[PDB]
Amino acid sequence: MKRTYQPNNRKRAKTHGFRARMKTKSGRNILARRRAKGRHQLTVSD
């Protein structure tokens, strides 16, 4: 039973990363939306 989650550092950093949210504005949208979300923690500190 190979599970859905197969942790890869360089992956979770390539997709989802702050630098990753940089390239597009859907992700910068996500950023500011998250900042106001309460003080959440945006992806790559987690």
Binding site for RNA (CB under 7 A): 1-12, 14-16, 23, 25, 30, 33-34, 37-43, 46
Residue partners of 30: CB distance under 8 A and separation at least 6: 21, 42
Least distance from RNA to the Cβ atom of residue 24, Å: 7
Least distance from RNA to the Cβ atom of residue 29, Å: 8
Least distance from RNA to the Cβ atom of residue 21, Å: 8
In angstroms, the CA 40 to CA 29 distance is 14
